Design a protein around this ligand. Structure first.
Ligand SMILES: C[C@@H](CN)C[C@@H]1CN([C@@H](C)c2cccc3c(-c4cn[nH]c4)c(C(=O)O)[nH]c23)C(=O)O1
Ligand SMILES: [Zn+2]
Ligand SMILES: [Zn+2]
Length: 232
């Protein structure tokens, strides 16, 4: 009823949307992994009379449910999607999207990692993002490669009309004590990558993590802190 939806409030298979700003929503879904349930976020950005989707809802059935929830709540077609790294909470559902007519995109690095690891593979390669600090425009957003962090390929997304920074899994929520799933992370470079985000987006008003509650710029420093302490 208006609060940001949480893991115990979303059954696995259902999707909720949350209005972040004019023409900007997050999507929230839940999924089981290794016998525990987790929430995860993505983004939806209005692109004239179409929508740009950032990240799947972590699985085929969740992503079908996402499309249905978008049709119910917004009613504009999703025409393009960008996945911000190669893990299943970002690309699982790309096959559903592609069969629904959504053009799916990711960096060449994400596409190679998804293919190698057996995850679903976005169709189109996003060039111009291979060096840390690179940025490219994609409809109503800017895509930014901050360097290795949660994964070597992680991208962040900025919505300049609303000063919304979607950090994806390179950014953790304020209540997080841990650095999340660090299986493919670079803990040594992660703080440097966060510093690049902080320098590049000093006017961000909302910061959205890949999992958990949005907040303000403090999520960036908090992420650096928790990663450094995990490494320690
Ligand atoms: C694990 C590798 C295969 N050996 C590929 C994995 C799986 N996976 C993704 C799909 C994943 C699964 C479960 C939990 C989390 C979290 C998290 C966040 N708070 N607590 C845990 C995170 C994150 O922090 O983004 N992501 C997760 C991921 O990230 O690595
Ligand atoms: Zn991940
Ligand atoms: Zn994640």
């Amino acid at each position: 009823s208006g609060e940001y939806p949480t893991v115990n409030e979303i059954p696995v298979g259902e999707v909720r949307l949350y209005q972040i700003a004019d023409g900007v929503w997050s999507h929230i879904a839940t999924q089981s992994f290794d016998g525990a349930v987790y929430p995860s976020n993505g983004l939806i950005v209005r692109d004239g009379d179409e929508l740009l989707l950032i990240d799947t809802a972590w699985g085929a059935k969740n992503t079908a449910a996402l499309l249905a929830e978008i049709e119910k709540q917004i009613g504009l077609p999703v025409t393009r999607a960008v996945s911000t790294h190669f893990h299943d909470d970002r690309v699982g559902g790309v096959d559903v999207l592609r069969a629904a007519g959504v053009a799916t995109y990711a960096s060449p690095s994400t596409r190679r990692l998804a293919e190698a690891e057996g995850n679903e593979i976005p169709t189109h390669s996003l060039e111009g993002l291979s060096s840390s600090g690179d940025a490219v425009r994609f409809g109503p957003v800017e895509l930014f490669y901050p360097g290795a962090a949660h994964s070597t390929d992680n991208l962040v997304v900025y919505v300049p009309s609303a000063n919304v920074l979607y950090g994806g899994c390179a950014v953790h929520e304020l209540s997080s004590t841990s650095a999340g799933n660090v299986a493919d992370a670079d803990l040594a470079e992660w703080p440097t990558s966060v510093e690049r985000i902080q320098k590049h987006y000093p006017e961000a008003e909302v910061v959205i993590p890949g999992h958990g509650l949005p907040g303000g710029l403090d999520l960036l420093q908090h992420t650096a802190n928790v990663v450094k302490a995990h490494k320690n």
